Structure formats: C-alpha cells, structure tokens
UniProtKB/Swiss-Prot annotation:
Glycyl lysine isopeptide (Lys-Gly) (interchain with G-Cter in SUMO2), cross-linked positions: 58
Protein name, per record: Bromodomain-containing protein 4
Function: Chromatin reader protein that recognizes and binds acetylated histones and plays a key role in transmission of epigenetic memory across cell divisions and transcription regulation. Remains associated with acetylated chromatin throughout the entire cell cycle and provides epigenetic memory for postmitotic G1 gene transcription by preserving acetylated chromatin status and maintaining high-order chromatin structure. During interphase, plays a key role in regulating the transcription of signal-inducible genes by associating with the P-TEFb complex and recruiting it to promoters.
Residue spans crossing the bilayer: none
Compartments (UniProt record): Nucleus; Chromosome
Taxonomy of the source species: Eukaryota, Metazoa, Chordata, Craniata, Vertebrata
The Bromo domain, residue ranges: 17-123
Length: 127
C-alpha cells in the first residue's frame, strides 16, 4: 500500500546523448502529450496512497509516468530514442494492465497513445 521510490531521473555514470531524435521526443512528443486535456493522471508517478490503490505496486513492477519522462529528457538521461519510446510504452501498458477496459483512465491513455503513435511515425531520421 506504500509508494516505492520513484524511477531514477539522474545517474551520473550512465552515458548520455543529445540527439535530434531525443530533441523531437521532448519538443514534439512529450510536449504534445503533456498539454493534452487527459494528461493529468500521467504527469507524475502514481501515488497509491493518495489514490487509494493499495495493490498498484503489487501488480506494476516497472512504473513509468510522463513526469519522470519529462525529467529524463530535460536532464539528458537517455542514450537513444528507443529508451525513451520504451518509457512511454511502459506507461501505457501499466495503465492497461492495472485497470479495466473502458475505464476512464484507459480511454485517457488510449487518446494519448494515439497521438504518441502519430508522432513516432514521423520520428526524424538520425542526423
Ligand atoms: Na487490465
């Protein structure tokens, strides 16, 4: 029923890059999803205490959220675009695993995921 430590957003010994694809993931993908009317449940780690989800972290062993992704992008945590894309996919998958089809939160995730897919489709070629 307690919250775990959040995913890390800083690891000085992890090697880092700033690439055109990563810049797109921040400026286009993250920013598009972040401003959406359905972003709010996904803007920070799930607070299982506040939300009264005592079993959340019993079920979800790889938590991810856009607050974490935003910090990772802004603090140049990633080596490549695939790591960040995987984080978005983890976030969506967790929501579908934990919740029931058609729940409000599932519809919200699906709307954000549709936009995510559209933007990833135009991921720029590595420069
Ligand atoms: Na489910």
């Amino acid at each position: 029923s307690m919250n775990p430590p959040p995913p890390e957003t800083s690891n000085p010994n992890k090697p880092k890059r700033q690439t055109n694809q990563l810049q797109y993931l921040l400026r286009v993908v993250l920013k598009t999803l972040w401003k959406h009317q359905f972003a709010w449940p996904f803007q920070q780690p799930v607070d299982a205490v506040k939300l009264n989800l005592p079993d959340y972290y019993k079920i979800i062993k790889t938590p991810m959220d856009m607050g974490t992704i935003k910090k990772r992008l802004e603090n140049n945590y990633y080596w490549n675009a695939q790591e960040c894309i995987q984080d978005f996919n983890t976030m969506f998958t967790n929501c579908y695993i934990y919740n029931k089809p058609g729940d409000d939160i599932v519809l919200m995730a699906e709307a954000l995921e549709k936009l995510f897919l559209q933007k990833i489709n135009e991921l720029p070629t590595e420069e």
